[PDB]
Structures are given as structure tokens and as C-alpha cells.
């Protein structure tokens, strides 16, 4: 059940495609998964692969609430290597009274895919304990989580969708990977109404954010009244760190205010030149966070740190001129079991929603872990809601830990 | 691609007969005059028979374009069955015709009296030749032939490895036999014949170089033989046997023996035993002999992984079940010579490896038993978190040795009353580098040692401490040393080992960091090293 023009699609090199090995899956996940895939080869949305096909892409499954299982595909590697329109990111979306987000996903099943490119969408289905070779599969529908599907979808339903935006221009509509973002300032009633209308439009209201309650975290530089030598060496290192990207900061006056007996327990009394220099740095750092400094031509980054136990702090920011765009916490939550990698995943998803609502894109996530600890916490975990964040592995550095706290 | 190797005159007398006996039945033909490629043909004499002609095909198995059989089925993942059959699909590639547009790269020259004339070139037409690259032609087509039978019969446990099918069931002998005949029928209807003489059906089973018994499996082929003039063929067979035994036993390395394999890929050429890759082969030799036996997984029982500890640079573990104490498999996690890991961290890494293996083989995660107090685990390496960690929720056992907390550092609130130190090193003029320390009390000294700037900056450390009290405050301008200290290692290499070795003696250290080269009180005077 699909006939509509095939948006033809090209690799950045037909020779260089995704060769990624499949994750280990539980008994339960293989059961649910082979059920899903077998059904979708009945309906024709998937088909068996060519015996000389060298590509693969990982698949996994999650327990969508109600226990009904769901198949997700990690298209991270393929997405980089293809990139062959749109409905653009509305500036007003981030200042709407409410913004409902809706999964489409299913409509993709009704849309064909370029069969000269589908060979690269291949994914292996494994069996428990390698009892047989994996059963390989290439795609026939628009695959969910694919990079070029929001385009091929939006251009395929262009003729029915853009009517509904030129009418009702009080709504700000956007689409990221497979989710549609409906933002409005109407009352809860008529908002629910129009979102219902648009749901039945793509039949051819689950999650709802209110991005005002999103604070700014308002970083602070604590200044003790009766300091010790060590409290001021921390103070010094921290401000020397700030001066690497903030102009007109100095640690000289307090540098020689720290002169005397050199036991870390020795006190100092506050001079006036150093106390004022300290104040200059303090108000220089509080006001540092500025989203208005975003540069759409540079890469966007989000860096995480474990600021003591049970709590991740992150900064979404940009490089060569280091400009912090916003900050954020994510505290381990009480009842459920949770390791630090899980708080990092949760944080990554919170960053994902914020960044999509404001910039319209996702940052690169810089996480202080190893490829082995991460990527083993995801293969068999709960807390995994979406395709995994694309991750850069960084070394823990004390200046950044002290900065984000 | 490759040049036909020298071949003993009494091998072609007996290999031309196999090649001629093969072009007669048609499995080969003559290549083309223009066929530029080649592959060597070797001849080994199987004990008490005729000469088995074995072709390499290792070179071209890379230019014959790629594909994508995701590991091995592990016999501990089989469960105990009242009835077991092992079908062998003989006629492996032997009659099954081969793609003619890939058929040219099949070329192999053959000697007459080793160049009494020019070489007789041949090309494999009918068979894929019993080569190694059956998994392409074999596994995914067999899998789709028998997958309907698999879905039809959930009461059976089927396992397809290269040319063995394994069928395990709890039906009676008669119903089981009938079903095995059902699948044999299905196989013949698609071309795959199962000869009655290679069937197993009987008390011990050969299966991927394992031996399956009712309660127990073990490594096939209970004796490793070390030849004193090792040709590379015999060596490769030794690496295969070792790799099979490596699924049951841990800690069996192939690396010095694979290093001992090198260029001159002739499988009747030889090597000479390097010293390390004889100790590997002898260690594996005694491990394999005096056999071990392991169990099958019991889905009706809790699964366990127990970490045991001896030596500070290795964590051993067993995946096993309880109340007969059935052991499913063993494994090791070794220390990293460069990294700043302590033993808690090696335990964590072992948990990662176990989680992977268990999920592949069993389909679930075991309960983790580790020898440590809840204190030395919840605090160490999950609450002193340089970098982050995915532990499970865990059962702590008390064993012969346990994992203890890393170090004696007291993080918050630098120690009241002990004298602060300051310390620095490096500043390479030329070869000359130095190291030194100063304290709030007058004490001070310079070392003026050899090394690099980094080793000079750690060698700076250990001299505040060798010359220090039992309590301390160290402050340094090195991000390297402060970083390692924040990972909390409990054993390292080199001079770092000695600094770790002085942290033995002391009761309370507090180390901290301040920016170097900003003229900070304390750092500045110790910078005077040049």
C-alpha cells in the first residue's frame, strides 16, 4: 500500500556506507522484535536483503508505556554518510503558552523509499545465542529515525499540510526527526481541538511542554567572609578559568592577598583592592550566560559533569569564542534505581527538547565517560526512550567541574 | 594474486591424482590463458588414508567483494534435552554449482615435477571447493530453508553452525526421530542431503569442536600436541584448538603465537618457537589436558556471576547457577597497565563483559556477586566519580580476599593541623630538568633529577611524601598529577608505582591544585628549580 513519487536519494559516497554491528538483545526484546519485523514484512514495509549487502544498522526495542513493545533504529552512522526543502524552525515556538509534541512515525509506513538507496538501510535481526545467522532486512517504507524522512515526508504531504498553516497562522508548527511540534497560545480547550484536527489530517495529544517554566539556573560564585588560604586558591583557580573567555578579569590583587603563612588552614582578612577585583569577576560570571550569542554556522555543544554524587550539570555552549548559551541540572530521582550514566541519558533528553525548541537542532553531547561504560549501559537498559544521543567522549577536568557548580 | 609455493616432489605424485580425479567428475576445469590471478595448493597426508588436497584461498577471500553469522553459539546456552540429534550436511559445497563471473579468481597453478614444465592452471567450476567461505553460500540460505520448520516446531531447539544442525527436544525418542526425519525431508527437497552415516543420534555428540554429554559438555579433542618443527599449518590448527578451549577456560592467549605467524604464508613452511609463544602453548596444553566439564543453562533457576579476586591486577569471574553449583563458563578481566584504574573499576569492567556475554548466550543478566563491603563499593568509584559508571544493583559477598577502598585521601575540609606542602618539577632547560618542594614551615629541598617534564612533575611528588609527616597538605600546579589522584588508582607502573607506594604509609593526605605560572604564593618559590 504505497504509490507516490520516489524521492531519489544519494550517498556522499556509494562506496562508504554504515558497517555497524548489532547490539545484544534480551530474550524479551528479541521475541517482541521478531514479532514486529515479521508483521512488517507481511505488510510489505520491509524486505529481505541482497546476499552481497555489506551494510548494517543497529535495531533495538523499548517498553512503550502500556507494555506494548516498540522498535527503534539507531541510524546515527548512516545519517552522517548520506545527506542528499522543509518547513522551517519558527522563532516564536519557544515562547508559546503550550507546545504539544506528537509522534508521526506511522504515516512513514505509507511512503516508498528510493530502492537504489534502500540497500544501505540494512539491519540484522539476531537469534538468542547465535542459534542461526542473523536475518537481514532492507527497508521499503520511509524508515523512522532516518535523517531525510522529515523532508521526504513534508514534501509528500505538502499539498495538504501548507493549507492548514496559512489558515490558522496563530500556530507555530515544526518537525524534528519523527515528531511534530504544535505550539500555540490558545486556551487548553481550543489548543486540544486544533491538535486533534491536525492528527486526523495526517490520518490519510500525548506530550505537552510549556517552555516559560524553563528557568535560567543563575550560576553563582560563592565568596566566603572569613576565607582560608585554600578557599582562596579555589577562588583563584576558578577566576583564572573565567578569564580565559571573559575579558578584563584579574587574580593579581588577591594573588598577593594570599601572601602570609602558607598553611591551608590560615585565614586572611579581606583587603579592599582584592575584594573589589573579586566582585568584578563575580558579576562578570553571573551575567556570562547569554543565548543571544548563538552562531548558526558553528557546531553546537553540550558538556556534562557530575557535580558530586546524584547530580549532573550541563552547559549548552559554543567553541572558539566560548559562549555559554544556557545551563542546566538533572538530579537523580528518588525511588527508582539509577546509575550516573542513566542521569546522563536523562539529561541528554532534556537537552534535546530544549535545544530543539530554541535552536531547532541537537547539540553534540560531551560526556566524561568511556565508550565501554556508556554503550554498555544503553544496550540493555530502561530509561532509553529515543534513538541514542550522538556522543563525544571527554576527559574529566577539574576546571569544568568547578565551573558548572 | 599470489605465487605457487615450492612443493615436494612426492606431494604432486599424489596431488595431481586428486586434481585429475576432480576435473574428471567436473568440480574444476582449466582456467583461461589470460587468467592473471592464482592461489597456492597444498597437500597434507591424513593419517591412514589418501592425501587431502587443501587450497589456501586466504588472499582472494578479501578481493571477492564483501558481505555482512554474528558470533558463535556457546554450548552452555544449550539446555539439557532428553533427545538430541546432530545432522551433518555433507556434500558441503561439493556438488553445488558456483557463480561463473566470480569463478575466474579461482585460479591455481599446479607443478609437473616442480617446473619440469610450466604449470597446469585450473579453475573451480562446480564446487566452491570446500573452502572457508561457505558462510556466504551456506548459512543464510540454509537458514531460510529451515526457518519455516523452526517456526512450526517451538517444542524443538535448533542450532545451525557451519555444516552441523543440532536438534534438541524433550519429546519421546519416537516423536523426536519423526520430527528429525521431517526436517531431513525438508532439506532434501531443497538439495541438501543428510547422509545416514554422518548422523549422530547417540550418546556423545561432536558439535563445533565441543563434546556434548547429557549433563555436561567439554572441549572436543582432549590432547594438544606441540610439534618441535612447527609448520605454519600445524600452528594454525593449534590456534584453532586454543580458541575453542578459550570458550570454556579463561586466560588463554594466542598473541605471541599469532605474532609467530608472519609473511611467507606457505603452510608447509615453518617457524621457530619464540620463548613467549611456547609458554602460551604449554599453558594451554596443560589446561586442555586433565579435562574440565561444564554445565548447561537451567532457565528455571537464578543465574549468577561471581567475581573472585587474587592479585591486584586481575579479576576472575564465573557465570554459574546454584544448588548443585553448576558452572556455565569462566572469564577474566585484566588490569590496564597505562590507566589509573583501581580494583573496584576492574570489577565494574568485568560486570560490563559479563552483561554482554550473558545477554548473548543466555538471554538475560545474572545476579552480580562481588567481594566488597557495601561501603567500599557505594563510596569507591561511584561516589568519588572522576568519570561515570553504570553498575547494576548488586549482591556483596565476603570472600578470601575482598576489594577495599582505594586511598587515604580526605576530600572535603583539608586536614586541620598538618603542615601544607608545595611542589613542582620539570622546566626542561635541555636534558636538565629538576624537581623540588617547599612548605609553610621553613623546610625545602630540590631534587634536580633526570626525566621528562611529566615524569619530573610526578617525581616531584613522592619527595614531599618520602620526606613528609604521616599527615600532609600537598598543593601542585600539575593537572596531570591531580587528575590521576582523582581517579584513585591503587596500583600503577613505574615511578607512579612508587608514589602509590609512599601513599601506603600515611594517615591523611589532602591534595589540591592551583593555576601554575600566575605567581601564586607557594607555587612560585618551588618553581625556582632552573
PDB file of C-alpha atoms in Angstrom, chain B residues 167-337:
ATOM      1  CA  UNK B 167      18.060 -30.647  17.226  1.00  0.00           C
ATOM      2  CA  UNK B 168      17.309 -30.965  20.933  1.00  0.00           C
ATOM      3  CA  UNK B 169      13.902 -31.867  22.338  1.00  0.00           C
ATOM      4  CA  UNK B 170      12.068 -33.367  25.297  1.00  0.00           C
ATOM      5  CA  UNK B 171       9.701 -35.462  23.188  1.00  0.00           C
ATOM      6  CA  UNK B 172       9.957 -39.228  23.280  1.00  0.00           C
ATOM      7  CA  UNK B 173      12.582 -40.939  21.136  1.00  0.00           C
ATOM      8  CA  UNK B 174       9.926 -41.824  18.551  1.00  0.00           C
ATOM      9  CA  UNK B 175       8.326 -38.385  18.129  1.00  0.00           C
ATOM     10  CA  UNK B 176      11.771 -36.764  18.137  1.00  0.00           C
ATOM     11  CA  UNK B 177      13.006 -39.172  15.463  1.00  0.00           C
ATOM     12  CA  UNK B 178       9.916 -38.455  13.355  1.00  0.00           C
ATOM     13  CA  UNK B 179      10.462 -34.690  13.549  1.00  0.00           C
ATOM     14  CA  UNK B 180      14.159 -35.010  12.664  1.00  0.00           C
ATOM     15  CA  UNK B 181      13.054 -37.021   9.630  1.00  0.00           C
ATOM     16  CA  UNK B 182      10.592 -34.218   8.819  1.00  0.00           C
ATOM     17  CA  UNK B 183      13.423 -31.683   8.684  1.00  0.00           C
ATOM     18  CA  UNK B 184      15.686 -34.075   6.754  1.00  0.00           C
ATOM     19  CA  UNK B 185      12.905 -34.359   4.170  1.00  0.00           C
ATOM     20  CA  UNK B 186      12.652 -30.557   4.005  1.00  0.00           C
ATOM     21  CA  UNK B 187      16.421 -30.384   3.478  1.00  0.00           C
ATOM     22  CA  UNK B 188      16.483 -32.891   0.633  1.00  0.00           C
ATOM     23  CA  UNK B 189      13.560 -31.138  -1.073  1.00  0.00           C
ATOM     24  CA  UNK B 190      15.858 -28.098  -1.428  1.00  0.00           C
ATOM     25  CA  UNK B 191      19.014 -30.042  -2.369  1.00  0.00           C
ATOM     26  CA  UNK B 192      20.755 -30.528   0.988  1.00  0.00           C
ATOM     27  CA  UNK B 193      21.186 -34.267   1.543  1.00  0.00           C
ATOM     28  CA  UNK B 194      21.897 -35.586   5.048  1.00  0.00           C
ATOM     29  CA  UNK B 195      23.813 -38.893   4.818  1.00  0.00           C
ATOM     30  CA  UNK B 196      22.777 -41.526   7.356  1.00  0.00           C
ATOM     31  CA  UNK B 197      26.387 -42.376   8.266  1.00  0.00           C
ATOM     32  CA  UNK B 198      27.284 -38.845   9.422  1.00  0.00           C
ATOM     33  CA  UNK B 199      24.218 -38.685  11.699  1.00  0.00           C
ATOM     34  CA  UNK B 200      24.882 -38.723  15.438  1.00  0.00           C
ATOM     35  CA  UNK B 201      21.702 -39.591  17.412  1.00  0.00           C
ATOM     36  CA  UNK B 202      23.876 -41.291  20.041  1.00  0.00           C
ATOM     37  CA  UNK B 203      25.417 -40.775  23.422  1.00  0.00           C
ATOM     38  CA  UNK B 204      28.313 -38.275  22.939  1.00  0.00           C
ATOM     39  CA  UNK B 205      27.922 -35.589  20.270  1.00  0.00           C
ATOM     40  CA  UNK B 206      30.568 -33.730  18.285  1.00  0.00           C
ATOM     41  CA  UNK B 207      29.432 -30.125  17.865  1.00  0.00           C
ATOM     42  CA  UNK B 208      31.731 -27.226  16.815  1.00  0.00           C
ATOM     43  CA  UNK B 209      34.729 -28.870  18.402  1.00  0.00           C
ATOM     44  CA  UNK B 210      32.788 -29.375  21.615  1.00  0.00           C
ATOM     45  CA  UNK B 211      31.678 -32.723  23.024  1.00  0.00           C
ATOM     46  CA  UNK B 212      28.119 -32.740  24.375  1.00  0.00           C
ATOM     47  CA  UNK B 213      27.214 -35.246  27.088  1.00  0.00           C
ATOM     48  CA  UNK B 214      23.792 -35.399  28.783  1.00  0.00           C
ATOM     49  CA  UNK B 215      24.698 -33.445  31.932  1.00  0.00           C
ATOM     50  CA  UNK B 216      27.850 -31.902  30.676  1.00  0.00           C
ATOM     51  CA  UNK B 217      29.809 -30.518  27.772  1.00  0.00           C
ATOM     52  CA  UNK B 218      33.556 -30.325  27.321  1.00  0.00           C
ATOM     53  CA  UNK B 219      36.217 -29.412  24.793  1.00  0.00           C
ATOM     54  CA  UNK B 220      36.486 -31.916  21.947  1.00  0.00           C
ATOM     55  CA  UNK B 221      39.920 -33.381  21.256  1.00  0.00           C
ATOM     56  CA  UNK B 222      41.349 -33.710  24.765  1.00  0.00           C
ATOM     57  CA  UNK B 223      45.139 -33.528  23.823  1.00  0.00           C
ATOM     58  CA  UNK B 224      47.188 -30.659  22.415  1.00  0.00           C
ATOM     59  CA  UNK B 225      50.415 -31.762  20.718  1.00  0.00           C
ATOM     60  CA  UNK B 226      53.417 -29.428  20.441  1.00  0.00           C
ATOM     61  CA  UNK B 227      55.450 -30.278  17.311  1.00  0.00           C
ATOM     62  CA  UNK B 228      59.137 -29.436  17.521  1.00  0.00           C
ATOM     63  CA  UNK B 229      59.437 -28.383  13.881  1.00  0.00           C
ATOM     64  CA  UNK B 230      56.191 -26.397  13.612  1.00  0.00           C
ATOM     65  CA  UNK B 231      54.977 -25.742  10.113  1.00  0.00           C
ATOM     66  CA  UNK B 232      52.585 -22.809   9.961  1.00  0.00           C
ATOM     67  CA  UNK B 233      49.702 -25.161   9.140  1.00  0.00           C
ATOM     68  CA  UNK B 234      50.159 -27.128  12.380  1.00  0.00           C
ATOM     69  CA  UNK B 235      50.492 -23.763  14.134  1.00  0.00           C
ATOM     70  CA  UNK B 236      47.177 -22.510  12.737  1.00  0.00           C
ATOM     71  CA  UNK B 237      45.464 -25.721  13.838  1.00  0.00           C
ATOM     72  CA  UNK B 238      46.939 -25.095  17.287  1.00  0.00           C
ATOM     73  CA  UNK B 239      45.472 -21.575  17.303  1.00  0.00           C
ATOM     74  CA  UNK B 240      42.088 -23.013  16.350  1.00  0.00           C
ATOM     75  CA  UNK B 241      42.179 -25.604  19.124  1.00  0.00           C
ATOM     76  CA  UNK B 242      43.273 -22.949  21.637  1.00  0.00           C
ATOM     77  CA  UNK B 243      40.447 -20.667  20.525  1.00  0.00           C
ATOM     78  CA  UNK B 244      37.928 -23.470  21.070  1.00  0.00           C
ATOM     79  CA  UNK B 245      39.306 -24.221  24.538  1.00  0.00           C
ATOM     80  CA  UNK B 246      39.161 -20.471  25.228  1.00  0.00           C
ATOM     81  CA  UNK B 247      35.349 -20.597  25.395  1.00  0.00           C
ATOM     82  CA  UNK B 248      35.413 -22.895  28.432  1.00  0.00           C
ATOM     83  CA  UNK B 249      38.712 -21.809  30.049  1.00  0.00           C
ATOM     84  CA  UNK B 250      39.829 -18.176  30.559  1.00  0.00           C
ATOM     85  CA  UNK B 251      43.221 -16.513  30.137  1.00  0.00           C
ATOM     86  CA  UNK B 252      44.490 -18.459  27.089  1.00  0.00           C
ATOM     87  CA  UNK B 253      46.389 -16.047  24.847  1.00  0.00           C
ATOM     88  CA  UNK B 254      47.083 -16.510  21.137  1.00  0.00           C
ATOM     89  CA  UNK B 255      49.011 -13.282  20.672  1.00  0.00           C
ATOM     90  CA  UNK B 256      52.640 -14.390  20.932  1.00  0.00           C
ATOM     91  CA  UNK B 257      51.759 -17.412  18.781  1.00  0.00           C
ATOM     92  CA  UNK B 258      49.959 -15.272  16.182  1.00  0.00           C
ATOM     93  CA  UNK B 259      52.930 -12.886  16.143  1.00  0.00           C
ATOM     94  CA  UNK B 260      54.966 -16.030  15.444  1.00  0.00           C
ATOM     95  CA  UNK B 261      52.881 -16.370  12.274  1.00  0.00           C
ATOM     96  CA  UNK B 262      54.060 -13.855   9.690  1.00  0.00           C
ATOM     97  CA  UNK B 263      54.846 -13.415   5.986  1.00  0.00           C
ATOM     98  CA  UNK B 264      55.769 -16.410   3.826  1.00  0.00           C
ATOM     99  CA  UNK B 265      52.189 -17.721   4.151  1.00  0.00           C
ATOM    100  CA  UNK B 266      53.307 -21.183   2.919  1.00  0.00           C
ATOM    101  CA  UNK B 267      51.514 -23.715   5.114  1.00  0.00           C
ATOM    102  CA  UNK B 268      54.402 -26.176   4.753  1.00  0.00           C
ATOM    103  CA  UNK B 269      56.984 -23.543   5.650  1.00  0.00           C
ATOM    104  CA  UNK B 270      57.941 -23.423   9.332  1.00  0.00           C
ATOM    105  CA  UNK B 271      58.610 -21.129  12.264  1.00  0.00           C
ATOM    106  CA  UNK B 272      60.819 -21.500  15.321  1.00  0.00           C
ATOM    107  CA  UNK B 273      59.432 -21.303  18.850  1.00  0.00           C
ATOM    108  CA  UNK B 274      59.888 -17.874  20.352  1.00  0.00           C
ATOM    109  CA  UNK B 275      60.129 -18.081  24.128  1.00  0.00           C
ATOM    110  CA  UNK B 276      56.768 -16.484  24.981  1.00  0.00           C
ATOM    111  CA  UNK B 277      54.750 -18.395  22.371  1.00  0.00           C
ATOM    112  CA  UNK B 278      55.989 -21.689  23.729  1.00  0.00           C
ATOM    113  CA  UNK B 279      54.820 -20.840  27.235  1.00  0.00           C
ATOM    114  CA  UNK B 280      51.415 -19.890  25.835  1.00  0.00           C
ATOM    115  CA  UNK B 281      51.148 -23.236  24.023  1.00  0.00           C
ATOM    116  CA  UNK B 282      52.313 -25.176  27.091  1.00  0.00           C
ATOM    117  CA  UNK B 283      49.965 -23.330  29.452  1.00  0.00           C
ATOM    118  CA  UNK B 284      47.079 -24.042  27.088  1.00  0.00           C
ATOM    119  CA  UNK B 285      48.433 -27.585  26.699  1.00  0.00           C
ATOM    120  CA  UNK B 286      48.070 -28.434  30.395  1.00  0.00           C
ATOM    121  CA  UNK B 287      44.784 -26.552  30.679  1.00  0.00           C
ATOM    122  CA  UNK B 288      43.269 -28.572  27.820  1.00  0.00           C
ATOM    123  CA  UNK B 289      44.589 -31.899  29.100  1.00  0.00           C
ATOM    124  CA  UNK B 290      43.277 -33.019  32.500  1.00  0.00           C
ATOM    125  CA  UNK B 291      39.906 -32.018  31.183  1.00  0.00           C
ATOM    126  CA  UNK B 292      37.237 -29.768  32.668  1.00  0.00           C
ATOM    127  CA  UNK B 293      33.489 -30.229  32.300  1.00  0.00           C
ATOM    128  CA  UNK B 294      30.798 -27.538  32.424  1.00  0.00           C
ATOM    129  CA  UNK B 295      27.036 -27.271  32.562  1.00  0.00           C
ATOM    130  CA  UNK B 296      24.015 -26.255  30.527  1.00  0.00           C
ATOM    131  CA  UNK B 297      21.775 -23.320  31.395  1.00  0.00           C
ATOM    132  CA  UNK B 298      18.695 -24.058  33.522  1.00  0.00           C
ATOM    133  CA  UNK B 299      16.088 -21.372  32.700  1.00  0.00           C
ATOM    134  CA  UNK B 300      14.123 -22.381  35.819  1.00  0.00           C
ATOM    135  CA  UNK B 301      16.970 -21.228  38.083  1.00  0.00           C
ATOM    136  CA  UNK B 302      18.613 -17.986  39.100  1.00  0.00           C
ATOM    137  CA  UNK B 303      21.692 -17.036  37.088  1.00  0.00           C
ATOM    138  CA  UNK B 304      24.795 -15.780  38.873  1.00  0.00           C
ATOM    139  CA  UNK B 305      28.119 -14.168  38.086  1.00  0.00           C
ATOM    140  CA  UNK B 306      30.646 -14.277  40.923  1.00  0.00           C
ATOM    141  CA  UNK B 307      33.744 -12.090  40.856  1.00  0.00           C
ATOM    142  CA  UNK B 308      36.688 -13.640  42.689  1.00  0.00           C
ATOM    143  CA  UNK B 309      39.910 -11.797  43.439  1.00  0.00           C
ATOM    144  CA  UNK B 310      43.539 -12.793  43.640  1.00  0.00           C
ATOM    145  CA  UNK B 311      46.314 -10.477  42.585  1.00  0.00           C
ATOM    146  CA  UNK B 312      45.618  -6.741  42.377  1.00  0.00           C
ATOM    147  CA  UNK B 313      45.802  -6.735  38.554  1.00  0.00           C
ATOM    148  CA  UNK B 314      43.206  -9.359  37.587  1.00  0.00           C
ATOM    149  CA  UNK B 315      39.558 -10.076  38.408  1.00  0.00           C
ATOM    150  CA  UNK B 316      38.314 -13.594  37.737  1.00  0.00           C
ATOM    151  CA  UNK B 317      34.659 -14.477  37.378  1.00  0.00           C
ATOM    152  CA  UNK B 318      32.322 -17.411  36.873  1.00  0.00           C
ATOM    153  CA  UNK B 319      28.867 -17.495  35.311  1.00  0.00           C
ATOM    154  CA  UNK B 320      27.098 -20.310  37.130  1.00  0.00           C
ATOM    155  CA  UNK B 321      23.917 -21.498  38.825  1.00  0.00           C
ATOM    156  CA  UNK B 322      23.391 -22.904  42.282  1.00  0.00           C
ATOM    157  CA  UNK B 323      22.386 -25.999  44.274  1.00  0.00           C
ATOM    158  CA  UNK B 324      24.498 -28.363  42.564  1.00  0.00           C
ATOM    159  CA  UNK B 325      26.844 -25.456  41.774  1.00  0.00           C
ATOM    160  CA  UNK B 326      26.771 -25.869  38.008  1.00  0.00           C
ATOM    161  CA  UNK B 327      29.419 -23.708  36.282  1.00  0.00           C
ATOM    162  CA  UNK B 328      28.418 -22.312  32.885  1.00  0.00           C
ATOM    163  CA  UNK B 329      31.608 -20.503  31.873  1.00  0.00           C
ATOM    164  CA  UNK B 330      34.605 -18.586  33.206  1.00  0.00           C
ATOM    165  CA  UNK B 331      36.260 -15.326  32.288  1.00  0.00           C
ATOM    166  CA  UNK B 332      38.879 -12.804  33.317  1.00  0.00           C
ATOM    167  CA  UNK B 333      39.253  -9.027  33.316  1.00  0.00           C
ATOM    168  CA  UNK B 334      42.871  -7.877  33.437  1.00  0.00           C
ATOM    169  CA  UNK B 335      44.263  -4.586  34.688  1.00  0.00           C
ATOM    170  CA  UNK B 336      45.281  -1.860  32.242  1.00  0.00           C
ATOM    171  CA  UNK B 337      48.972  -1.023  32.586  1.00  0.00           C
TER     172      UNK B 337
END
